[model samples]
Target: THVLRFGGIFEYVESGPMGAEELAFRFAVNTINRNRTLLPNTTLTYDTQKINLYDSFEASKKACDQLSLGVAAIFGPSHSSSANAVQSICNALGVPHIQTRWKHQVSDNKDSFYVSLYPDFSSLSRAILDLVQFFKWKTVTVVYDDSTGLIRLQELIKAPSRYNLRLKIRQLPADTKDAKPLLKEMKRGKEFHVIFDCSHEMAAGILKQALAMGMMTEYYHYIFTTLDLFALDVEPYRYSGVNMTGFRILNTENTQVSSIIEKWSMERLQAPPKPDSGLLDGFMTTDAALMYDAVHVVSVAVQQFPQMTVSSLQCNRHKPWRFGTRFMSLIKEAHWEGLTGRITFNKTNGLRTDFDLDVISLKEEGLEKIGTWDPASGLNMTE
Candidate 1:
């Protein structure tokens, strides 16, 4: 049996409604099952014991340390913050870690690995610039958390020089118990066209206050840097005229992929909620794919080779897998296409595949996909 390991921020996973552990398990198994369809002859099985979920980075790193010692590969720890924390541990122990959307530095290193392309804030910045250009944005206020908020702000500010685009940049305070001061600032300055880098319950509260403080749907709205649009899942106050988007594929409009996703969704409890729970999310994103890739990657690195002795695996402890930090970097530079698509690293010190940015509009009912921007192209794109 092949022992591949994975873990994620269980608390953050979409459970109780959605959480990471359940999602990770669902994804890891789904990937193995999907691979079996292509590799029917392969008798190898995956050991789920390697999969774990943690509430924090420290806890997750401890788990990665334990699993990395004996396993051929690792995946998950879905959150970027957690993934970043586990990196030093992974490097020190010489265990290969393939993660989800972590910071740029993780991919910057050679030992650590991630399934998605490098975390490029520039992509988000590009989209912001595009929006500012297309809509004629003058003043843009940024509402984000310090956790990753600084990265978002920097990306936005760099847009003018990088893309020859410019706009006024305003920063919001960290997540606060009350947004009265923020509301007052927005009202006083009237900084329309806001972008928010937040998620969870805070998203809803802020959206309400933003509207009360003069945020409009068509003319002005919020933006996200990533794919976590769940921020719009608020009540009482609707997102009637708000606009928000992210740097991930919101709409899998490709006929084949969409049809497959549709079929998968229908079979998933008939008709799921508009924002389907995190259960199937594992398969939807590259979570499952990453785990599957790690299996193949580690197999190629350690399996059926002359050095593939139990004694070697158990006693050596020095032969760490070296897939090259530039694997994604080279892929994008050369426009490397895989089953996923043309995977590549960003020009801005980041590694990731060619991901489509999702630009969705906020309607009275909920969030809907209104636009999509491919970082490859500076404009909003669609299939």
Candidate 2:
């Protein structure tokens, strides 16, 4: 049995749920090994690197180190600051770069080596705009933490509606620790529907700030753009009666998902929670699930080309993966049912196009699946 190695990079170093992304990466490798036919003789292993998301210098070195190990593919670094640098390196070296975050811009020319499992921001924005229109909200306030955030929402802002919707866009001040001032200003506005697009950490901060400002009530409705909203400790707002709705890519109720977590829980139950690593549900977030599918995709592609060679390359040299293009092509054309559901990519760009996104609203009963969206069928409401 041949053991193939992959590479991954995560933002921070922690254990248990706090390190769910890394854990998911590992889990996928193990899951692949279980399928005797997938990689019949190939056992999968990976080298993981943790770098500060804000530090580009460190990010590159860690990525280089992984690349030098003769890894077949690269998984993540969800934070944009580090992700872009990693993507540039992957694009240059022909390593398949798999991302699971909101890519602000859509590329006209698809890079043969890059594939993002996250729903295209363009389509995601369309879905959000569709919901906004469905609600017939005449006025909405958009809040973002970074410059790229607005670019992702441009479609939503420019969408033509029968109501001639009014919108106010504001950037979160750099002083983010206390968003009360910003929340206070927004509270005075006439808009009741608020769309929040920010980092997961910032999302929590803003929600906390909103709570402090008493903005969590029936009158105001909040739409969150982040997909990992379910992982956060949102218990406090469940009974508050605020109309909080968001999109989710991962369906935890899927039997496959429960099986994965059931296995993970048993494996991790021996460990105690640490200060940095709070207990997190088994890689239930979109990031981890996407990475999990990425591992299997790579395995499938490599198995299809059993004779393909993976050579150790460096960031300093211009050498790219020999079969990276063919590998990407195989993966793009491949089909599989992952935790996120059926996966298919556009031949033009290695971006996922055939998958359903759940429109979730936090009600007293918890996360309610109110609707679904996809490229072919558009939005279908279940409520």
Model 2: per-residue lDDT, tens digit, 278-336?
21443356777787777776677788877666689988889788888787778777777
Where is model 1 more than 4 Å wrong at Cα? 1-18, 34-36, 43-69, 76-85, 88-95, 104-119, 159-177, 212-214, 217-219, 234-248, 254-350, 363-371, 380-383
How much is 162 displaced in model 1, in angstroms?
7.5
State the TM-score for model 2: 0.86
Backbone collisions counted per model:
18, 0
lDDT at position 354, candidate 1: 49
Model 2 clashing residue pairs (backbone): none
Best by lDDT: 2
Q: Global CA lDDT of candidate 1, please? A: 0.48
Over 227-327, each residue of candidate 1 has an lDDT whose tens digit, in order, gives 54533443433545555554444345556545544444443434334443222232344443333333443333332332222211222254544433333
